[PDB]
């Protein structure tokens, strides 16, 4: 789990892209770790304010009836 | 409210707010809160105006 992914150094994002495609990493000692048996989930705070803006778009209405 | 400066352009709405507690207006104007917002408050600048309009559009109170 990668919480607060929206607030992170840009260089960390470069590592993440490598993991998603290559599927493995190598540390400073040269040993290679595996990621073919893991699930990556990242939690971002962005878009939540957009969702609540849809909830407060009208006085007493929301957008939950729209298609997912 | 349109009028000459100092003739009571802002004082006209002043008495309406006080009469709200005494229910001196009709039922259509009853249960309504009147807010006198200064023009100096307001993309970034229009966000406050849009939020105020949105919260008072579908409400009507």
Swiss-Prot record, chain A:
Function as written in the Swiss-Prot or TrEMBL entry: Required for growth at high temperatures, probably by acting as a chaperone during heat shock and targeting heat-denatured proteins for degradation by ClpP. Required for biofilm formation. May act as a chaperone regulating CtsR activity.
Protein name per the record: ATP-dependent Clp protease ATP-binding subunit ClpC
Subunit structure comment from the entry: May interact with ClpP.
Induction comment from the UniProt entry of this chain: By heat shock. Transcriptionally regulated by CtsR. Up-regulated by heavy metals such as Cu(2+) and Cd(2+), but Zn(2+) and Co(2+) have no effect. Forms part of an operon with ctsR, mcsA and mcsB.
Lineage: Bacteria, Bacillati, Bacillota, Bacilli, Bacillales
Entire-sequence positions represented here: 615 to 682 of 818
Family: Belongs to the ClpA/ClpB family. ClpC subfamily.
């Amino acid at each position: 789990l990668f919480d607060e992914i929206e607030k992170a150094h840009p260089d960390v994002f470069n590592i993440l892209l490598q993991v998603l495609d290559d599927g493995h990493l190598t540390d400073t000692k040269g040993r290679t770790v595996d990621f073919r048996n893991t699930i990556i989930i990242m939690t971002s705070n962005v878009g939540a304010q957009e969702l609540q803006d849809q909830r407060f778009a009208g006085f007493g209405g929301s957008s939950d009836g729209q298609d997912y | 409210l349109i009028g000459e400066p100092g003739v009571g352009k802002t004082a006209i709405a002043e008495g309406l707010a006080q009469a709200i507690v005494n229910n001196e207006v009709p039922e259509t104007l009853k249960d309504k809160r009147v807010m006198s917002l200064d023009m100096g408050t307001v993309g970034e600048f229009e966000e406050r105006l849009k939020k105020v309009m949105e919260e008072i559009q579908q409400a009507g109170n």
